[PDB]
Structures are given as structure tokens and as C-alpha cells.
Amino acid sequence: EAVKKWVNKIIEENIIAVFAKTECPYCIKAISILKGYNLNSHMHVENIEKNPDMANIQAYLKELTGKSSVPRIFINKDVVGGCDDLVKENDEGKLKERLQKLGLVN
């Protein structure tokens, strides 16, 4: 209960929600790509490794998204997925489209 509620609040309060771990190159890459769209003001990055309930958080992220790995990325509560999913969306125009619909990029 408590873990799910805590994860949900992060995804709800923040248009761009990224779950990450320490020293995680694909986390860093994904976050960098998102900040490249000037999304900082609407991003939250949570380091779930620095948390006593890492496994519970990962299990819930898998229930929500299909994978327990980080990074795990949500945009307005919709699942993007991991960094590779973000790269695909970015390269194919889908990321920009998501962001335009949210008023985050012109």
C-alpha cells in the first residue's frame, strides 16, 4: 500500500517522472535527453536504489510498465518505458508530439 502510494504520487505530481538508480548510464542518458527539451521544470528524478524499498518499487514499476529495470519513464502518467523506448520515440517524432500536446514544447 504505502510503496504504491508513494510511487503513484511521484508519477502524479510530476508530468515527467523518471525512476533511476545510482551510476546508471542509461538513466543519465534518458534524463539528459529529456532535459534537452527544457523539461527540467516539470521533471522529477527519483533514485530508487537509495531507498529501503527498492525491490518493492521495482516490482510495482514492473506491474505498471512490464519491466523492473531502471530507468523507468512516465510522461503525464503514460508509460514511455526505458531509455531505449525514449530514443525510439525521440527519433521517430513521437516524443516531440507528446510534449507539444502538453504545452511543453512549441
Q: What DSSP letter does each residue of 7-76 carry, written as one string?
A: HHHHHHH-SEEEEE-TT-HHHHHHHHHHHHTT-GGGEEEEESSSSTTHHHHHHHHHHHHS---S-EEEET
Q: How was this structure determined?
A: X-ray
Q: 49 a known binding residue? A: yes
Q: 38 a known binding residue? A: yes
Is residue 104 a contact partner of residue 41, using CB atoms and an 8 Å limit?
Answer: no
Q: In Å, what resolution does this model reach?
A: 1.0
> Strands 72-75 and 78-81: what pairing?
antiparallel
User: Residue 36 burial (CB < 10 Å; 0-12/13-18/19+)?
Assistant: exposed
Q: 92 a known binding residue? A: no
Residue 79 C-alpha cell reads as: 508509460
Give the CATH fold of the 1-106 domain: Glutaredoxin (3.40.30)
Answer left, alpha or beta for residue 44, where phi above 0 means left and psi between -120 and 50 means alpha.
beta
Q: 76 a known binding residue? A: no
| CA–CA dist 90, 45 (Å, integer) | 19
* 52: preceding bond cis by omega (within 30 degrees): no
Is residue 44 a contact partner of residue 20, using CB atoms and an 8 Å limit?
Answer: no
Query: What are the extents of the domains in the chain?
Result: 1-106
Q: How close are the terminal C-alpha atoms of the chain, in Å?
A: 39
> Cell 530514443 appears where?
87
Is residue 24 a contact partner of residue 18, using CB atoms and an 8 Å limit?
Answer: no
Residue whose C-alpha is closest to residue 32's, from 58, 71, 68? 71
